[PDB]
Design a protein around this nucleic acid. Structure first.
Ligand code: MG
Ligand code: ZN
Ligand code: ZN
Ligand code: ZN
Ligand code: ZN
Ligand code: ZN
Lengths: 131, 505
RNA sequence: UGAUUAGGCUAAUUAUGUAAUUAGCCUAAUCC
């Protein structure tokens, strides 16, 4: 009964994330120690003519970005645990996330390490010109 | 890469997958969005209304080796070294039904302390905004085996209450034994799935109020504490896990347990499976194998008890050997062959099952030498034999007494931990049918240089007096004898033992 | 029409007669 969702290679770190007190530190320590980053994310085929903002309702990737499904790049959605937000609502789910092309080796961990700007909605250091 | 797993299985009854913006994985995306180059297309196809999909927690694997994070699935040796932390653990299950199909949730959790907790059926539900850990529809397993689980489907308590109850029970059990918790399981899959509801892991931490290792976590306080400081804490921090079935067993738990033990019978409840699991682990580690190279630390007055045991033994053996005018002694159970008392000169012979000195024989005792060893006394100081001869002096531990250095064991026996782990068979008075309990008394012959006792065998007491040199000595011997007796040791002597035969000296 | 493991059969895809993965069905073991 039911349908499978995850590969076996991802079953190890996610299990750790299901048990740790601080899931973000657990995932980052797993990745920096040489562990394999999460795979099987939802990559989108885009014409590469987008605005470039971090989170959008449609794919808005530029020539130097890739578009991912939001729930596929959220660690709390991937591990199916509680979100550390107000009212438990994910800010990625239901939307598309633009990741820089030099970070596509770890779309999830990048989302754990960067936050968009509150004014221009770009990533800080990857499009935010609010200097 | 390509091998899928049953973990996080979508247990919903929906006939179609999710859209790319909502699906957590590429595999879970509906096939109408996919292309050949492993990519998705944002079609204008209408987005769904709010949904609820049950996610399975079956198939956890704690094999990660992140530095700084302790290894929680310990091996056999580390399990033996952590025997004071052993808690049996079994969870009964309930099948998800109605809106979902394909996962099981805990219904009853049982522990080897004899406690069962009934929980409401709670699972993980994915929605359009995030996740929930909420109640779901559930069904008891079919068959006559699980008919006792039918009334329990309406008697469950909330998971946050059960978490605190579990933490409190573990605190009460393990406060004076260890800083660690080791869950002994028979099938670790569903046990780990249930442990995900009430256990947290991470780096090793210190208790916030003292220097002990932290074993409990408080989410409302976000703090760590040990067993004595874990009031109101709702999570178990860094527990160990042991899978007995991986230790080379064939068949189910009941047939493997019943082969070596016949004490832990009863009705089918989760705490009974946990008790049988811990009993089987004890039998596997300390009866089938003897790892006497492992030395355990000191929790309490074990050095003092070890000192007092010799003080009792020397006086008891001297007084037994003087009364009756005996000349021969067989010291069964002496690996080194060191005599205990030597003021009455007698011939000594040493026997042990694993001797370490060529002055000691290699005899095993099976009662058949009752007439053979009848010319002299036999000594059974902490040697367990199912039938003792009449002319013997025996010291045996009463396994029905529970203490910090005496854990429950297999088939009525117990695990006595004093610098080493010894399994002791169950205490049975039928083995002493030819013997009588040894009365309390003190006999010494040191020269002399208020207290009045009828059992203080002393040359002054023959004259109706007493000296301080013997009075304080009698007081310390009383303290030592009382400590030895309270710890759980019982002394048995031959039938003709009378203290009035010692007054002739 | 509860879960996993091992074997067998079928279908699809991929690779180069054969193999891997996925999906379904049967058998056995354990868990429920
Ligand atoms: Mg059971
Ligand atoms: Zn999320
Ligand atoms: Zn900005
Ligand atoms: Zn403390
Ligand atoms: Zn037993
Ligand atoms: Zn005196």
């Amino acid at each position: 009964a039911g349908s499978n969702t995850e590969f076996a290679s991802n079953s190890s770190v996610l299990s750790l994330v299901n048990f740790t007190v601080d899931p973000q530190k657990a995932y980052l320590d797993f990745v920096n120690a040489g562990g394999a980053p999460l795979t099987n994310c939802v990559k989108m085929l885009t014409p590469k003519t987008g605005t470039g903002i971090a989170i959008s309702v449609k794919p808005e990737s530029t020539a130097d970005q890739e578009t991912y499904g939001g729930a596929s790049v959220c660690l709390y959605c991937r591990a199916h645990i509680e979100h550390p937000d107000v009212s438990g609502v994910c800010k990625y789910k239901g939307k598309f996330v633009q990741i820089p092309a030099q970070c596509v080796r770890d779309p999830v961990g990048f989302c754990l390490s960067n936050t968009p700007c509150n004014v221009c909605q770009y990533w800080i250091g990857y499009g935010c010109n609010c200097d | 890469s390509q091998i899928v797993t049953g973990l996080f299985k979508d247990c919903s009854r929906e006939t179609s997958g999710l859209s790319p913006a909502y699906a957590p994985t590429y595999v879970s995306v509906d096939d109408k969005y996919k292309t050949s180059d492993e990519l998705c297309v944002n079609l204008n196809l209408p987005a769904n209304v709010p949904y609820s999909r049950v996610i399975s927690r079956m198939g956890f694997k704690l094999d990660a080796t992140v530095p700084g994070y302790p290894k929680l699935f310990i091996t056999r040796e580390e399990a033996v070294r952590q025997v004071r932390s052993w808690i049996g653990f079994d969870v009964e299950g309930a099948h998800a039904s109605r809106n979902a199909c394909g996962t099981n949730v805990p219904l009853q959790l049982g522990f080897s302390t004899g406690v069962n907790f009934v929980v409401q059926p709670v699972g993980v539900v994915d929605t359009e905004w995030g996740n929930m850990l909420t109640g779901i529809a559930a069904r008891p397993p079919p068959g006559e085996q699980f008919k006792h689980l039918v009334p329990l489907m309406h008697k469950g308590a909330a998971w946050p209450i059960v978490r605190r109850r579990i933490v409190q029970m573990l605190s009460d059990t393990l406060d004076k034994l260890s800083d660690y918790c080791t869950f002994v399981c028979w099938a670790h899959g569903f046990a780990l799935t249930s442990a995900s509801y009430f256990c947290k892991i991470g780096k090793e931490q210190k208790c916030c109020m003292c220097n002990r290792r932290a074993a409990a976590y408080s989410s409302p306080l976000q703090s760590y504490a040990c067993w004595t400081h874990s009031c109101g804490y709702d999570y178990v921090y860094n527990p160990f896990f042991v899978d007995v079935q991986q230790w080379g067993y064939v068949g189910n738990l009941a047939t493997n347990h019943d082969r070596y033990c016949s004490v832990h019978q009863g009705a089918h409840v989760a705490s009974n499976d946990a008790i049988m699991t811990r009993c089987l682990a004890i039998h596997s580690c300390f009866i089938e194998r003897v790892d006497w190279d492992i030395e355990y630390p000191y929790i309490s007055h074990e050095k003092k008890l070890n000192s007092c045991c010799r003080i009792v033994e020397r006086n008891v053996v001297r007084a037994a050997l003087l009364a009756g005018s005996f000349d021969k002694v067989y010291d069964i159970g002496n690996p080194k062959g060191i005599p205990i008392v030597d003021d009455p000169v007698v011939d000594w012979h040493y026997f042990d099952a694993q001797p370490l000195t060529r002055k000691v024989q290699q005899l095993f005792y099976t009662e058949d030498m009752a007439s053979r060893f009848a010319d002299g006394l036999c000594l059974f100081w902490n040697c367990n034999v199912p039938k003792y001869p009449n002319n013997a002096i025996v010291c045996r531990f009463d396994t029905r007494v529970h203490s910090e250095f005496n854990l429950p064991g297999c088939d009525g026996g117990s695990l006595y931990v004093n610098k080493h782990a010894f399994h002791t068979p169950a205490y049975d008075v039928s083995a002493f049918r030819d013997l009588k309990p040894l009365p309390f008394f003190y006999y010494s012959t040191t020269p002399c240089e208020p207290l009045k006792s009828a059992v203080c065998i002393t040359a002054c007491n023959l004259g109706g007096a007493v000296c301080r040199k013997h009075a304080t000595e009698y007081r310390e011997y009383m303290e030592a004898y009382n400590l030895v007796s309270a710890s759980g040791f019982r002394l048995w002597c031959y039938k003709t033992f009378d203290i009035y035969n010692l007054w002739s000296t």
